Design a protein around this ligand. Structure first.
Ligand SMILES: CO[C@H](C[C@H](O)[C@H](COc1cc(F)cc(F)c1)NC(=O)c1cc(C(=O)N[C@H](C)c2ccccc2)cc(N(C)S(C)(=O)=O)c1)C(=O)N[C@H](C(=O)NCc1ccccc1)C(C)C
Length: 373
C-alpha cells in the first residue's frame, strides 16, 4: 500500500535524504541515501569514524561473495569496496525481498558525512552508469525483474529536521496538488532532461538553450544544490546580485563559502528572485516551467540570527537539478514511459506573496536544438 510508504524518508538539513533498508539474513537495518545521480547500491561494511553501524557480511547466511573489487567516484567524494549479493528489503516500501548486488564499502574519501545518520547509498539511475560496468544490475532493476513492483518511483523531498516520501512502484495523488507535467528522459543513463529556457523574475536569461544543457542536464536527489554550467551560473548570479543589490553580501557568499545572517524573522525574501526552468514537454513544440522560490536556493545553516548559504553553484559537467529544485516538487521517475513528472508538492516551502509552481503548456520552437551532442 502507498500509505505505508508516505513519510519513509528522513534526514538532517543539508545532509541527505535516506530510506530504511535491511540487508542479509537475519536482516541488518541500515539508513540509505536516496541517489538518482548514480546506479550503485553500496553500504559501509567496515568501521568508519562517521559510521555508527555497518554491514557485517560474516553475520549473513545469504551473503554471496562476487570476488570482484569496485570503486565509485562522485563529484563530492568516492569509495571502494568488494562486490557481493544479498537479500534486501525496504521496511516502509513494497512488501518484498530481493537478491540484489551490494558493494561492501571498505574504504572511502569524503563520502560519509558526520552526523548525517545514513550508512549507505541507493543509486537509482540506469545500468549504463553502474560501476564497474553496465553488467552490474542496479537495485531497482533487480526489484522490477524479481517482483511485480511497477517500473516507476516518485520522490517527495520536504525541506523547510528533513523528511519526505519515496513511493516505490507508483504515484500517490495525495502528496501533490494540481497536475503532473512530464519531461522526456532523453537517454537512459543519468536521469537526463532538456532545459529549453531560463527566466529570473520573469526576465529571459536569453542564452543559447544549448548552454543550459552543456554538456548534460540531470535530475539528482543526491546533490544538494542547483548546479549550473559556468556560463549559465555567471549569468544567474549576475541577475540575482542585481535583484538583491539593495543589501550587503561578501562575494564569497556567492561562491557558497560564507553565510549571510539577518535578525531572526527579518530575512528580506522579497529581494531575491524566483527562478523558472522550462523543460521539454511531451508533445511537439511544447514545454512547461517549474518555478523555485529563494527559500529553496538560500538554505538555512544552523544566536537569534537566521543564517543562509547560497545553494546555486558552478559545474563543469552540466546542469544538476539537486534538492534545491526537487524540494519544491513531487517528482515522478516514470521509467516505464521514459519521462519525469513534476507537480507542486503538498510540502512546498511558503512565501507570503509568491508560490513554487508547475505551469503549462508553453510553446517552444526548436527544442531539440537545446540538447548537447
Ligand atoms: C552526476 O553527479 C553524481 C553525483 C551523485 O549524486 C553524488 C551522490 O551522493 C554523494 C553524497 C556524498 F555525501 C558523498 C558522495 F561522494 C556522493 N552526489 C554528490 O557528489 C554531491 C553531493 C552533495 C551533498 O552534499 N549531498 C548530500 C548527501 C545531500 C543531498 C541532498 C540534500 C542534502 C544533502 C553535494 C554536491 N555538490 C557538488 S554541491 C555542493 O551540491 O554542489 C555533490 C555523480 O557524481 N555520479 C557519478 C559520476 O558521475 N562519477 C564520475 C566522476 C565525477 C567526479 C569525479 C570523478 C568521476 C557516477 C556514480 C554516476
Amino acid at each position: 500500500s502507498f500509505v505505508e510508504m508516505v513519510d519513509n524518508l528522513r534526514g538532517k538539513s543539508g545532509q541527505g535524504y535516506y530510506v530504511e533498508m535491511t540487508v542479509g539474513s537475519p536482516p541488518q537495518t541500515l539508513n540509505i541515501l536516496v541517489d538518482t545521480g548514480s546506479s550503485n547500491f553500496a553500504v559501509g561494511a567496515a568501521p568508519h569514524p562517521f559510521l555508527h553501524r555497518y554491514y557485517q557480511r560474516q553475520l549473513s547466511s545469504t551473503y554471496r561473495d562476487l570476488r570482484k573489487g569496485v570503486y565509485v567516484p562522485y563529484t563530492q567524494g568516492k569509495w571502494e569496496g568488494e562486490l557481493g549479493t544479498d537479500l534486501v528489503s525496504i521496511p516502509h516500501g513494497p512488501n518484498v525481498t530481493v537478491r540484489a548486488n551490494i558493494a561492501a564499502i571498505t574504504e572511502s574519501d569524503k563520502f560519509f558525512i558526520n552526523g548525517s545518520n545514513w550508512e549507505g547509498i541507493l543509486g537509482l539511475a540506469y545500468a549504463e552508469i553502474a560501476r564497474p560496468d553496465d553488467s552490474l544490475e542496479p537495485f531497482f532493476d533487480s526489484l522490477v525483474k524479481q517482483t511485480h513492483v511497477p517500473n516507476l518511483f516518485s520522490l517527495q523531498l520536504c525541506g523547510a529536521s528533513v523528511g519526505g516520501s519515496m513511493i516505490i512502484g507508483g504515484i500517490d495523488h495525495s502528496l501533490y496538488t494540481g497536475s503532473l507535467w512530464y519531461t522526456p528522459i532523453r537517454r537512459e543513463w543519468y536521469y537526463e532532461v532538456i532545459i529549453v529556457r531560463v527566466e529570473i523574475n520573469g526576465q529571459d536569461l536569453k542564452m543559447d538553450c544549448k548552454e543550459y544543457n552543456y554538456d548534460k542536464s540531470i535530475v539528482d536527489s543526491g546533490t544538494t544544490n542547483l548546479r549550473l554550467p559556468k556560463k549559465v551560473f555567471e549569468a544567474a548570479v549576475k541577475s540575482i546580485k542585481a535583484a538583491s543589490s539593495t543589501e550587503k553580501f561578501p562575494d564569497g557568499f556567492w561562491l557558497g563559502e560564507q553565510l549571510v545572517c539577518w535578525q531572526a524573522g527579518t530575512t528580506p525574501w522579497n529581494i531575491f528572485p524566483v527562478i523558472s526552468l522550462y523543460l521539454m514537454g511531451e508533445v511537439t513544440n511544447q514545454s512547461f516551467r517549474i518555478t523555485i522560490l529563494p527559500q529553496q536556493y538560500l538554505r538555512p545553516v544552523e544566536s537569534q540570527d537566521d543564517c543562509y548559504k547560497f545553494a546555486i553553484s558552478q559545474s563543469s559537467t552540466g546542469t544538476v537539478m539537486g534538492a534545491v529544485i526537487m524540494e519544491g516538487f513531487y517528482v515522478v521517475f516514470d521509467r516505464a514511459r521514459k519521462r519525469i513528472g513534476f507537480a507542486v508538492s503538498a510540502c512546498h516551502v511558503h512565501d507570503e506573496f509568491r508560490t513554487a509552481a508547475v505551469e503549462g503548456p508553453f510553446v517552444t520552437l526548436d527544442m531539440e536544438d537545446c540538447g548537447y551532442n
